Amino acid sequence: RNLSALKRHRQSLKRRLRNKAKKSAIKTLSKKAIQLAQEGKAEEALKIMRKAESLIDKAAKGSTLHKNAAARRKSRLMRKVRQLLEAAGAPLIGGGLSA
Amino acid sequence: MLTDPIADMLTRIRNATRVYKESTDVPASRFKEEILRILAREGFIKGYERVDVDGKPYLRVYLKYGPRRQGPDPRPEQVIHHIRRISKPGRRVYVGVKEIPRVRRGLGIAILSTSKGVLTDREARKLGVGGELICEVW
Amino acid sequence: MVKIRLARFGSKHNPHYRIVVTDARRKRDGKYIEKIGYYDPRKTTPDWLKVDVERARYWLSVGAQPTDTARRLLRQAGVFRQEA
Amino acid sequence: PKKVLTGVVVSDKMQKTVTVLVERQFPHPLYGKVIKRSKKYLAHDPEEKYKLGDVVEIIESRPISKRKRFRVLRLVESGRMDLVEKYLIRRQNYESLSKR
């Protein structure tokens, strides 16, 4: 009394539970850098920010994030961290920043 | 007050011919003459001399009339049977070279002001222009 | 992708396909991108076919896609002969 | 081309924004009488320089905000609070038409 393409949904769940979990990470992880770059720790932060940059740009191998999305993320990310550390902090590792 | 000078002249004429007279005047105007300039060259009238009325410059306009008919009402036929204003100040009428009139299947004339001076139903089509359609006469 | 196919015209029991370029997601008798000739699978006319090769191959240079049956005509129309 | 219009300013009570009042003459489609119209736009003025009476110009632009898709071009003749008069009266008189 149906079609077998009900798969698509039956699949679409995995993809959902897949890039949902992938994304909950980016959020909590994009936080680390924010919190740190807010409080001096330029060194330890500018390694989470490189990572963040990873998970973000890495994500662009699927149907999770795409287009100017990862670009808009960083654009606001590795611009927000530089402003925070700008207040005191003093740079430590450009590992991700063409200062 | 004169909310419309052109019309005033046309009517100034219309009211004279109806009673048959040799000439009626009318306040001077650069634009007013270029209009009479058409009627002379089209023979709708005789001519006119920039006469003067008490310091004020007028335009003695001279009228033509048909031959003195006979029988009841010996009054002659009109050279200018009909004349009425088209593009009024309360409503301007603008037409292109393709939207030009057609007075009495040629038997009449139409006067319009264009970017190439004061022309005729014809000249407008010949020149290939168009502008404010002043009036019609026949 | 954009395709080149037949579009029924004329009437019932009387085809007069229009050959044209349009998106594959349009109805076969829908709004096409550019008309480039016709065809009468009945052979009841001297002009039972016609193509604008100059305009046809152009869509091929931009990456068109003819039907398996639209090929036939296109090939049997003298548009594929590479030549040299 | 990006639409370009000439209008005057009547408002600047918005942080960074001014209101420009435009006009356009065109014949009536049925009666042919040359008539006027009007349309108030919300002009974007970042460096709030222009004030009231400024007969200025504007250009079609990307969406600044809801209701605000017009940047200012140039001045055309400031110091014309006379046009802002007849506009101010109109809205002024709208308190005399009240069905009350």
Place this chain on the structure above:
Amino acid sequence: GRYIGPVCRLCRREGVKLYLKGERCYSPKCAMERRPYPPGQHGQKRARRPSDYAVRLREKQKLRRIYGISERQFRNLFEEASKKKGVTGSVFLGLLESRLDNVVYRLGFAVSRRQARQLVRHGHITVNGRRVDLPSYRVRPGDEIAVAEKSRNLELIRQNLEAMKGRKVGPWLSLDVEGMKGKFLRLPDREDLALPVNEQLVIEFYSR
């Protein structure tokens, strides 16, 4: 379909010979040389001044009743004719004569229009060598109208063609009596054929 029944009565309703019969409507009368007055109980009674309408109605029926064609097909032509430019009135009869069943009557293949229909209908008529059983068929310049082989006989055809000797054809036609072939040379202007019908009155009747 087409009209069927009393026709000599029409011959005399309009008050004019129209030769819808073969010999009779052509012999001593369409029943009229006997009684040249209108049918019905009120025949031998004086008439009332026919109104401008009734005149155009009568002058129309006349023409249509002549070619014996329904009001359907009929007006369709006038409109098609009227659609054109020039005179239409003249153009009208042009489209009337172009009918197949008409050409046959003229080309003497048949005596009456109603006989000419039976011919075309049954398939005993040709056109450039085609079986054309459609009386509605419109003919143009140079079209050849002959008889089919299965029919190039029949004791009725020879009679009709034979009678056609000692008679001429329109300035827009040409018959090979001895061969059973004819040709439509051109569209016959108003002149090319005179008739009891003032077209101009038929034009008026259609601008109600």
Place this chain on the structure above:
Amino acid sequence: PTINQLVRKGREKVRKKSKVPALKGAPFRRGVCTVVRTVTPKKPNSALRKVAKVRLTSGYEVTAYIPGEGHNLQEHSVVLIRGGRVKDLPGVRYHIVRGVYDAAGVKDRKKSRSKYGTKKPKEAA
């Protein structure tokens, strides 16, 4: 009126009142009879015209004329409305179609049978 006035006011479009509303716009309307009587007509005329008060679908109830000579319409008779007034009978702008539902055509009708819902009779045998 000056042309200026016309740009202000504009020429108002007439509009037209329907003479047959009970119909709801369609050509006909199925209904049901309530009272069947005869009423003295109006004007210079005189008689006893056969009419019917009809309860129809659209919760309406209007008076309807019964054409011809003699009908078979009782109280709970079904019927169909036509449209078109009588005149002599003020306040009745609808005729009844014959030979439909509970309205039988006029018997022994030989002339205009299209109306009166009478079928073609037999000639000889």
Place this chain on the structure above:
RNA sequence: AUGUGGACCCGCCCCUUGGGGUGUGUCCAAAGGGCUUUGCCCGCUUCCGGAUGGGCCCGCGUCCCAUCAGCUAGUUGGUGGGGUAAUGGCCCACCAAGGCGACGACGGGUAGCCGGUCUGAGAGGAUGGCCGGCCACAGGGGCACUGAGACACGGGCCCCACUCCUACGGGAGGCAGCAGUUAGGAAUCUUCCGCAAUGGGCGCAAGCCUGACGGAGCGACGCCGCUUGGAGGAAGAAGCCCUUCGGGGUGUAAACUCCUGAACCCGGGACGAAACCCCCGACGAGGGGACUGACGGUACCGGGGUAAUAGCGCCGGCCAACUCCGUGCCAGCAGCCGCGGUAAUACGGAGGGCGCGAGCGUUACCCGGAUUCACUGGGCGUAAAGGGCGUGUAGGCGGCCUGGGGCGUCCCAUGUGA
């Protein structure tokens, strides 16, 4: 891991609204499967272009009621964020108090819009049904997921209503898809055939699905073509009508005599089909070969072959067509004017005539006539119509000459108007 390249931060360069480029830092990739395999093919991966399809925004145009005259708190602008492919007050904080409306806001009512369509001399008026473009919806609402793209008819979750199965111990469903049923209604169809053709998806390809589509089915619903026959045939039968009883009409109409002979009978029988595919040439080009028809043995062709459905409206005037009888303001007709009272061309029947013809009438609705909303193209002393009279706001309108500008206006050119 690799990075041709791409992504983002900063400086720099050009351009200049986040466009291109540069430098530096950091981040980012992959997929194999089948073989006339050892070389091709079917795919994978990142990038810069092409093409196609979109999203968003803007100018102008887009009905009725002012007997709806004032509307607004995310409301208007700002700042900064969140958000998306990205602009945006889209969303969220805070700042300021703005934003809209007689050029008709807000409100109620009606409506999917256009190409077109109908009418009209025209301008206009009316309309948006089939076909085509766009929008919106998929039992009523809300929502998000997947994905390049949906907030998704035949996908999912939740609420609601409705309905169905049940060993009731519990679950199911969404025809505004094709047909069909039911109710509503004046009323609108086959529960058909076929994937042969065309189009679509999947695939290397055979091949597969395709109520898209090609067809067939039902309905004079429409337009169109066609038939119920043709010639001859009387001073013109019978019958039925009138009649001044002399006669007139139906009427060549029939009969009748010849002629053909639609339908039906027999045989034949399609165009619609050619490719994909296969062989040769390398699967390129080319050439050659082969396959497949639903409609259906149907259209059409031959020959045989029978005179074979005619109905409807009207005949007072407008408006074409007249008499008898019946009836007697009764029964009845009627678009309007009006017909019927014992002589009715107006009711009812008959005879006859006019008008159409597989149609003829009726009702309803749109335009026309109506120039009767009048732009084209009208009026206001007495026919409907000058405000009871001023003052004045906005608004409309504006005198003679000359110059700048050239908005309106006008010409040319070009794009678009599928």
